[PDB]
Design a protein around this ligand. Structure first.
Ligand code: NA
Ligand code: NA
Length: 128
């Protein structure tokens, strides 16, 4: 399925080239521009654990998730991955725990040492 495919066929987008964040572009976005550090980014996403369980979805809340890019307001894999996206792009990210929640995990649903799969849509980005 999609998590296996990004694991085996994804692109390493880390600057360390340690395979910690792998990406596949699923829907090509608009133009060439990617968001800049500090931009307000608006995303829709779904996240799955490596046991197949959905742990989160913004679609199910009928509102996007909004954060300031590159500020550590989200897991490292998202700061790195969203920074590569064009407006309107949909991608898959496969995130090793060192770029996610590490040994701590995140209650209620994310265990220790968890590799995470996300589908992410970059809806918009805006500077301030
Ligand atoms: Na595929
Ligand atoms: Na891209």
């Amino acid at each position: 399925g999609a998590p296996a495919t990004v694991t085996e066929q994804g692109e390493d987008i880390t600057s360390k080239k340690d395979r910690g964040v792998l990406k596949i572009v699923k829907r090509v976005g608009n133009g060439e521009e990617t968001p800049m550090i500090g931009d307000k980014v608006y995303v829709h996403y779904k996240g799955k654990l490596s046991n197949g369980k959905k742990f989160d979805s913004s679609h199910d809340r009928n509102e996007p998730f909004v954060f300031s890019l590159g500020k550590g307001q989200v897991i490292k894999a998202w700061d790195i991955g969203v920074a590569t996206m064009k407006k309107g792009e949909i991608c898959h990210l496969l995130c090793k725990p060192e770029y996610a929640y590490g040994s701590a995990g995140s209650l209620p649903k994310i265990p220790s040492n968890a590799t995470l799969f996300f589908e992410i849509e970059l809806l918009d980005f805006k500077g301030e």
